[PDB]
Point group: C3
């Protein structure tokens, strides 16, 4: 139950990191227009 | 419950990340990059 | 458990800020 939480939080930490990089790419692209 | 509150927050984050990623993917389709 | 709460607060903060950045892009692209 705790292990289930830990795994999901780890997934979320990773997913947030990678999603932010995609947002930063968009910001770069849109900002150079 | 302190544990229940944590599980709720995690479920919230999982939902939020799903939906936010879809919004980012949409932007990526629109930007074409 | 406390370390997990800290990570979750981190995620909640990061999601909030990231969403606002996504919202700004939606206005611009939109």
């Amino acid at each position: 139950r705790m292990k289930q939480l830990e795994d999901k939080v780890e997934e979320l930490l990773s997913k947030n990191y990678h999603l932010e990089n995609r947002v930063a790419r968009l910001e770069k692209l849109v900002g150079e227009r």
